Amino acid sequence: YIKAEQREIKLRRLAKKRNQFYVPAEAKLAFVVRIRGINKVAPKVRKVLQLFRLRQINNGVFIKLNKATINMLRIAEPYITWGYPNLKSVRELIYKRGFVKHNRQRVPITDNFVIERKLRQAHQIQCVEDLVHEIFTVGPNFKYASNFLWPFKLNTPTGGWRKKANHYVNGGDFGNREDQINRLLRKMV
Amino acid sequence: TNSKGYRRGTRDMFSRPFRKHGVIPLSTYMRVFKIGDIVDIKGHGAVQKGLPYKAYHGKTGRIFNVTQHAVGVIVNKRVRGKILAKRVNVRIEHIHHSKCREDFLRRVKENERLLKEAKEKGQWVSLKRQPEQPKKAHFVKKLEEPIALAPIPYEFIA
Amino acid sequence: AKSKNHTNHNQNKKAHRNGIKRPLRKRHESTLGMDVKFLINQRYARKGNLSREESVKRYNERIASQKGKPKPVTL
Amino acid sequence: GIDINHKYDRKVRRTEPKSQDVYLRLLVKLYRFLQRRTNKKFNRIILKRLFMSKINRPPLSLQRIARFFKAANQPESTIVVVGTVTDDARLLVVPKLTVCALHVTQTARERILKAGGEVLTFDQLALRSPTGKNTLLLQGRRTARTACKHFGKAPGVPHSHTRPYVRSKGRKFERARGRRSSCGYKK
Amino acid sequence: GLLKEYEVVGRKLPSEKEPQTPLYKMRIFAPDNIVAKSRFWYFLRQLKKFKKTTGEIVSIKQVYETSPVKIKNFGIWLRYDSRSGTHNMYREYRDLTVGGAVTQCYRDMGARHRARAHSIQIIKVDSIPAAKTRRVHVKQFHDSKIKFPLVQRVHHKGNRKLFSFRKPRTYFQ
RNA sequence: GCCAACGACCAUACCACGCUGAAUACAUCGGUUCUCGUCCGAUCACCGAAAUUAAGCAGCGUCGCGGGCGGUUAGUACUUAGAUGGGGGACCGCUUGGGAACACCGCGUGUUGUUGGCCU
RNA sequence: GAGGUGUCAGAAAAGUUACCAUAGGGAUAACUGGCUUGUGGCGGCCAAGCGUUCAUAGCGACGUCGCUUUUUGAUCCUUCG
RNA sequence: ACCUAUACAUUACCGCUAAAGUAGAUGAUUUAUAUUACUUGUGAUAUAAAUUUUGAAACUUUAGUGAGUAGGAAGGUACAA
RNA sequence: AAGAUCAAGGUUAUGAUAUAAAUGUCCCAGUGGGCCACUUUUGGUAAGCAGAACUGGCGCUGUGGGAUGAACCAAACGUAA
RNA sequence: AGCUGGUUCCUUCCGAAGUUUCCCUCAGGAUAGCUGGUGCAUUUUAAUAAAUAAUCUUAUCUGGUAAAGCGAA
RNA sequence: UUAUUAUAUGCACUUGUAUGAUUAACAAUGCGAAAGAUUCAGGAUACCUUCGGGACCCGUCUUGAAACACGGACCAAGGAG
């Protein structure tokens, strides 16, 4: 993780010195949290929300940023605010807010051991933090890891703008606000 | 009250579109249709025998019968409301092989090549199709000169 | 006393409730409109097959003794 | 705004047999102790197989006990039937086995005991074989019942062979219009 | 409304068979990194097709006011949309900030014309050196020997007493 | 290359106006016993002797006529999705996705399967 | 197979009730109110012309925008125990 | 910046659904010790102390959720015999 | 051409999910009088008008908000801090 | 009497439809659709997936609306 | 080569930390003061008072009922899947 921050910083440093613009690798991994209803929602979007598992307002899941997913988030836009989550934020969410799906039932965590509990077959994953590595990095067992978490259910952040249903451009909320989510998300936990 | 006959709204469904006019040229038959192959139904209105009833145009089925001058294609058609399966006997003059299936077959052969190639490289396979990810650290070199130019606008003019 | 003829309102809600429900890729293969003949010698096919390791081996031994068929594919 | 905790969360299947029978539940209680305590699926399904309604429990006949003997790797076998066991007159030769059953009809008990087999209660099969060793679990023919015939009663779609719900069978009882091509339509 | 100035660049997708789609840039006034991209496509569309997500963003970067203590006159050239009526302006603003100029612009445009922030398009930015300031209000500021009366005041309410017994006292001498 | 027969795709193969077409040849083109078909041996049937690549057909040319494709036109038009956005309304900006058409411009003016022959 | 029910998945059927009766209906007329405002009434905008001259003192084509709801239709929301 | 729905977060608690165990007591389990065996340290046994008699057609234990007419099912309550 | 016997195959060959799903019986009630809004529209000058297309509500829905209000907005309500 | 009026305790849980078709049908039924209940068979979609269902995406088809056209029929 | 971190750190005792809903150390006060009975805490019982906020008439047909829709003055008892 620490090395990962240094690689990005150094690429930027070396380029700019050589006159070169190295434009840094486009972001993987989004966190999606539900601002909207369920009631007074169009059915296309209602269906998309169930599949995401986002059952209630301010419940949030991690969703792999793919060409597949991003189109569902587009029809879901006025219903969702989403961004790129920092590692601090993922760590704050799992340890306090992170429950497990074991035969329906939504089951604590907090133990390393209960995360070893399943995910040791997805090797090198025997810890609470090792689950968040897998989420963060979009590791190959992301399907099961994301599934294992039952949607984290998160208070409200902080003064969350009256206009609500406007694209983030318009001062709204709703949008891929990019890196500005880190301020939001950390406060909402 | 209503629409109802069979040919309702089929002015443009059964229209031969400009410069494709006349007698259905022989290649259509030459294609061998074999049971279990995926077929698309495209209404050719110049071949008036074995007409695929208007709901079945661009609804595509798999072949479960080959009969002397008809191909019986099982299209699954959404009813109000219980998806019943219909065997429609339609002619090859209206029946064109879907190359939706070939994409699958091309994949088997390609997957087997990648598998073999990887195994002879020792490691690693990863032959499953991943959709276009947010890519890469992109370096733009001037070359051929720095950028910049902004834009617009005087766009009056009625 | 003008009532209202025809709304397809709520029909599509109705359908998804207990799913419109696709049937099966039957490995156990359904028939109808097979031109009676294939069916007759399909019946015979199953019957005459009686089982089979010796049957295939004896007719392979016939094919090597006869060899057989340069003519059929070209005609 | 729960999207969506609709249904079904009521599910399907009996925890406990729908029967007042004090005997029956003791077997359930016995095999329920044997379930998790000794692993193995013979305990798991026999517990379930006691839950079973009278339909889904339809009587297994003695000739079905005798055809199972003709099976390979089956000669030393204590045939399990969670069911009523019914006497089939037509089997001339009834083979030796011990048969464990809920109930055995008195004519069926004589042809097992003549064979010379033992008619056994499941609690004594549980003692003998808590590991379900050398059993064979037989389930009856549910397709036999007159109710199953009647379902699907539909005319149109080239079907049914279903039996119309008829108090009396004869001429002038539903032979006419709609059974035959003559009086308008074929079924 | 927070007026931050942003350099945004966007190429139009990437094929290896198909070289090096040309690189356009813009200066964008946005509170928001996202609004920087949002406006950027809309203005890019006006010359050069390029729909996002057949569109490649590229880099979003904020640019650095060169002189925020610096005492300069800016002319901005502006297009606005009126109800039946889209027209062009030149107005000149004396501000610290190119950021501060635009923020004072959206407010001023908003006021007088009823000037929609969505109905306003920027156009162009230049710093006016030196008597090219048509600007009658502006050129008053350029004047040797710029002394000016303080006209009036502004009475904090009331006081640190809600109860002000010492009477304000509009006097001030 | 050309030519034939048999064709696929189906106007880059058409159209118009010229020029050219060697050879195995299509064709041009002749004869009318017979079979056969026609009012008429024009077609059609037959015999294949004398001429000719002008035509058909093919190719070659043409800033043609037409036809194809791409860009340009145009991210516009138009439209999905959003707002306790605007406008009196008619409607219109913005914002998230998708995306034309005529036109103009450029470049091409049949390609190829089987099978036989000819080869300048 | 045919002969047919066109109310065409198939009764065999004439008026009148202001002498009337019932069960109901604001799912429904008449009628108040409400929407509408074509139609009606009232008021403008532009202004070719009238008006000796001079478009608007008073008027005003061809056009065009309204307001009123007091005309008449359009409607049936409410009202037919 | 502030205010604020039965929304949203957490918690106790109701119910319903879910998910798991519970049913060697002539026995089991815990605790302390004396003896004995092995070994550092553990078990066996003896003794003393303590817990345990489960509507096991229920409890202990667990989690997620609850608008509601028409209607359906489930479980009680009251009344006369 | 089917039935199909036999042998070969690195990673199962888009993405999230599954509140488990599929299936049968009852031939079960209740319904067969809808109403409203975004968008799209036909008749009509138009209507709180007559009638579609898609989708959501209201019907069966309070609470908070729009001063008010069946339907619009926000939101679906066990009981409380 | 297809009509009007009324129908007698509670709680818990789930929870509609004004649509289709036929009917002297159109103030109503039957019928299909929506609804509950009863369950059943299997859970790699099950008890200490290389089997799917159905929504994105992708790949592969269809269409004569919006727009455009009339120096195109 | 250096730093950092973990393992090689056992046994006794422990009001040490947690043990997955970990509120109690510590202390004060009322008081159970025999029967008798003081004093403290707590309460939308009936009902009164004082303050805020909310509460339109049920049954019903109906798209929608507080309706300037219909029955019902009030009460008991018979009284209908």
Swiss-Prot record, chain A:
Gene name as annotated: RpL7
Domain of life per record: Eukaryota
Full protein name: Large ribosomal subunit protein uL30
GO cellular component: cytosolic large ribosomal subunit; cytosolic ribosome
UniProt record, GO biological process: cytoplasmic translation; maturation of LSU-rRNA from tricistronic rRNA transcript (SSU-rRNA, 5.8S rRNA, LSU-rRNA); pupariation
Job of this protein: Binds to G-rich structures in 28S rRNA and in mRNAs. Plays a regulatory role in the translation apparatus; inhibits cell-free translation of mRNAs.
Naturally occurring in which organism (per UniProt): Drosophila melanogaster (Fruit fly)
This protein's UniProt keywords: Ribonucleoprotein, Ribosomal protein, RNA-binding
A molecular-function term among this protein's GO annotations: structural constituent of ribosome
Positions of transmembrane segments: none
Family: Belongs to the universal ribosomal protein uL30 family.
Swiss-Prot record, chain C:
Residue numbers spanned by region Disordered: 1-32, 46-75
Gene3D superfamilies: 6.10.140.1730
Molecular functions (GO terms): structural constituent of ribosome
Transmembrane segments: none
Biased composition (Basic residues): 1-28
BP-aspect Gene Ontology terms: cytoplasmic translation
Residue ranges that the Swiss-Prot or TrEMBL entry lists as coiled coil: none
Record field: compositional bias (Basic and acidic residues): 50-61
UniProt KW keywords: Phosphoprotein, Ribonucleoprotein, Ribosomal protein
GO (cellular component) term, any one: cytosolic large ribosomal subunit
Pfam families: Ribosomal_L29e
Family: Belongs to the eukaryotic ribosomal protein eL29 family.
Protein name in the entry: Large ribosomal subunit protein eL29
Organism: Drosophila melanogaster (Fruit fly)
UniProtKB/Swiss-Prot annotation, chain D:
Coiled-coil spans in chain: none
Family, similarity comment: Belongs to the eukaryotic ribosomal protein eL18 family.
Main location: cytoplasm
InterPro entries: Ribosomal_eL18 (IPR000039), Ribosomal_eL18/eL18-A/B/_CS (IPR021132), Ribosomal_uL15/eL18 (IPR021131), Ribosomal_uL15/eL18_sf (IPR036227)
Localization of this protein: Cytoplasm
Domain of life of the organism encoding this protein: Eukaryota
Biological process according to GO: cytoplasmic translation
Any GO CC annotation of this UniProt entry: cytosolic large ribosomal subunit
GO molecular function: RNA binding; structural constituent of ribosome
Gene: RpL18
Protein known as: Large ribosomal subunit protein eL18
Keywords from the UniProt entry: Cytoplasm, Ribonucleoprotein, Ribosomal protein
Matches recorded under PROSITE patterns: RIBOSOMAL_L18E
Curated annotation (Swiss-Prot), chain E:
GO biological process, one term: cytoplasmic translation
InterPro entries, A to Z: Ribosomal_eL20, Ribosomal_eL20_dom, Ribosomal_eL20_eukaryotes
Keyword vocabulary terms for this entry: Ribonucleoprotein, Ribosomal protein
Gene3D superfamilies, per database record: 3.10.20.10
The keyword Cell membrane appears for this protein: no
One Pfam family named in its UniProt record: Ribosomal_L18A
Transmembrane segments: none
GO cellular component: cytosolic large ribosomal subunit; cytosolic ribosome
Gene Ontology MF terms: structural constituent of ribosome
Family affiliation: Belongs to the eukaryotic ribosomal protein eL20 family.
PANTHER family: 60S RIBOSOMAL PROTEIN L18A
Protein name as it appears in the record: Large ribosomal subunit protein eL20
Native organism: Drosophila melanogaster
